[PDB]
Design an enzyme around this catalytic site. Structure first.
Site, PDB file in Angstrom:
ATOM      1  N   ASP A  51      72.311  20.147 -50.103  1.00 15.35           N
ATOM      2  CA  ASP A  51      71.907  21.504 -49.741  1.00 15.35           C
ATOM      3  C   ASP A  51      72.687  22.650 -50.385  1.00 15.35           C
ATOM      4  O   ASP A  51      72.084  23.570 -50.939  1.00 15.35           O
ATOM      5  CB  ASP A  51      71.913  21.667 -48.217  1.00 15.35           C
ATOM      6  CG  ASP A  51      71.104  20.593 -47.512  1.00 15.35           C
ATOM      7  OD1 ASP A  51      70.317  19.892 -48.174  1.00 15.35           O
ATOM      8  OD2 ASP A  51      71.244  20.447 -46.286  1.00 15.35           O
ATOM      9  N   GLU A 164      66.447  20.641 -41.118  1.00 19.16           N
ATOM     10  CA  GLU A 164      67.591  20.903 -40.257  1.00 19.16           C
ATOM     11  C   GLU A 164      67.175  21.823 -39.116  1.00 19.16           C
ATOM     12  O   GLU A 164      67.605  21.648 -37.976  1.00 19.16           O
ATOM     13  CB  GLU A 164      68.733  21.535 -41.053  1.00 19.16           C
ATOM     14  CG  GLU A 164      69.443  20.534 -41.952  1.00 19.16           C
ATOM     15  CD  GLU A 164      70.614  21.138 -42.710  1.00 19.16           C
ATOM     16  OE1 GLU A 164      70.856  22.359 -42.587  1.00 19.16           O
ATOM     17  OE2 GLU A 164      71.292  20.378 -43.433  1.00 19.16           O
TER      18      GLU A 164
HETATM   19  N1  AMP Z   1      83.806  21.511 -47.100  1.00 20.12           N
HETATM   20  C1  AMP Z   1      83.074  22.613 -47.141  1.00 20.12           C
HETATM   21  N2  AMP Z   1      83.395  23.612 -48.011  1.00 20.12           N
HETATM   22  C2  AMP Z   1      82.603  24.690 -48.094  1.00 20.12           C
HETATM   23  N3  AMP Z   1      81.480  24.948 -47.393  1.00 20.12           N
HETATM   24  C3  AMP Z   1      81.169  23.898 -46.541  1.00 20.12           C
HETATM   25  C4  AMP Z   1      81.909  22.751 -46.333  1.00 20.12           C
HETATM   26  N4  AMP Z   1      81.424  22.025 -45.259  1.00 20.12           N
HETATM   27  C5  AMP Z   1      80.418  22.753 -44.861  1.00 20.12           C
HETATM   28  N5  AMP Z   1      80.092  23.794 -45.703  1.00 20.12           N
HETATM   29  C6  AMP Z   1      78.907  24.714 -45.671  1.00 20.12           C
HETATM   30  O1  AMP Z   1      78.119  24.466 -44.493  1.00 20.12           O
HETATM   31  C7  AMP Z   1      76.801  23.990 -44.846  1.00 20.12           C
HETATM   32  C8  AMP Z   1      76.420  22.951 -43.822  1.00 20.12           C
HETATM   33  O2  AMP Z   1      76.743  21.628 -44.295  1.00 20.12           O
HETATM   34  P1  AMP Z   1      77.368  20.509 -43.394  1.00 20.12           P
HETATM   35  O3  AMP Z   1      77.782  21.078 -42.078  1.00 20.12           O
HETATM   36  O4  AMP Z   1      78.620  20.126 -44.299  1.00 20.12           O
HETATM   37  O5  AMP Z   1      76.446  19.366 -43.413  1.00 20.12           O
HETATM   38  C9  AMP Z   1      76.898  23.521 -46.280  1.00 20.12           C
HETATM   39  O6  AMP Z   1      75.587  23.665 -46.847  1.00 20.12           O
HETATM   40  C10 AMP Z   1      77.907  24.500 -46.836  1.00 20.12           C
HETATM   41  O7  AMP Z   1      77.352  25.776 -47.147  1.00 20.12           O
HETATM   42 MG    MG Z   2      73.171  20.659 -44.899  1.00 18.49          MG
END
Ligand code: AMP
Ligand code: MG
Ligand code: AMP
Length: 258
Positions: A51, A164
């Site tokens: 994503d 999502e």
């Molecule tokens: N390690 C990370 N570093 C930077 N942005 C993050 C990270 N983890 C989450 N995100 C952001 O949160 C969104 C949700 O993804 P997630 O919660 O990691 O499945 C991602 O699409 C990113 O924009």
């Molecule tokens: Mg995601």
């Protein structure tokens, strides 16, 4: 049916044209920036996953085109890495960055702030469960991105999409706290379709709590006939999380009464 109603609400389609959808999202970003010229940067958290890699590529493309068209050199796409201590996915993030070729990459480690917030709560009498700590991390990432946007005259780009949104699988005011979401309407496999069209390295895009798989969700979103038990699960999640897809509840709302 409820399935037709949900598909309509999320704007999902059974089949999409990859290149055409790439242009819809890029023109969308370009149009917004031209309508609000005080915005000079797009801020996006990059995790090394499907994503954010897709959203990131689209953001850089929008900025690239706008610079060439208007000649404004102050416009910039800012990719933000937000690791919690040492992320075991760094190499993937490195490859994601090499693919996106962002104008700027800022690295902010959120571990210090999360531990501090937890210590303050602990002293007050509140210990967190792993699940709640996870949401806390998501909200700290939101905070960092908004502070960066506040100092660079930018807006925060979100990665929320149909697969999502339908289950509300995001943290309220965490990764769900964004300004503009260019991927909204696409399901999971369709997101892969766009990345393939952008020649994204295969390894960059290829559970319980949602007792269904992403294929079940994508099929549902595409209007396909799925097992009834599967449809009920997806719909249960949808109904249960309507509060996440609407502004704070007031005395005027009645959606929660049905
Ligand atoms: N390690 C990370 N570093 C930077 N942005 C993050 C990270 N983890 C989450 N995100 C952001 O949160 C969104 C949700 O993804 P997630 O919660 O990691 O499945 C991602 O699409 C990113 O924009
Ligand atoms: Mg995601
Ligand atoms: N016209 C806009 N459209 C979408 N988001 C914007 C716009 N103007 C400001 N924002 C976002 O809202 C934040 C200002 O909200 P606040 O932090 O409550 O002052 C900025 O840091 C941007 O992230």
């Amino acid at each position: 049916t409820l399935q037709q109603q949900i598909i309509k609400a999320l704007g999902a389609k059974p089949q999409i044209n990859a290149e055409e959808e790439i242009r819809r999202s890029v023109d969308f970003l370009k149009s917004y920036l031209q309508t609000y010229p005080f915005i000079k940067s797009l801020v996006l958290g990059i995790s090394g996953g499907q994503d954010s890699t897709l959203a990131g590529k689209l953001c850089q493309m929008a900025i690239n085109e706008l610079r060439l068209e208007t000649g404004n050199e102050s416009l910039q796409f800012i990719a933000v890495r937000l690791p919690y201590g040492v992320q075991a996915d760094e190499q993937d993030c490195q490859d994601a960055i090499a693919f996106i070729q962002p104008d700027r990459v800022l690295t902010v480690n959120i571990k210090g702030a999360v531990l501090a917030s937890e210590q303050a709560l602990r002293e007050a009498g509140i210990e967190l469960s792993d699940f709640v700590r996870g949401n806390e991390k998501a909200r700290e990432r939101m905070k960092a991105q908004y502070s960066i946007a506040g100092m660079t005259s930018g807006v925060v780009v979100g990665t929320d999409h149909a697969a999502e949104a339908i289950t509300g699988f995001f943290t309220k005011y965490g990764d769900g706290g964004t300004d503009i979401n260019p991927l909204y309407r696409l399901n999971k496999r369709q997101g892969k379709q766009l990345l393939a069209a952008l020649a994204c390295p295969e390894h960059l895009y290829k559970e319980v709590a949602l007792g269904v798989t992403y294929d079940n969700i994508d099929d549902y979103l595409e209007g396909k006939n799925v097992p009834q038990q599967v449809a009920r699960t997806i719909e249960n999640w949808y109904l249960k999380t309507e509060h996440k897809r609407r502004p704070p509840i007031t005395v005027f709302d009645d959606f929660w009464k049905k």
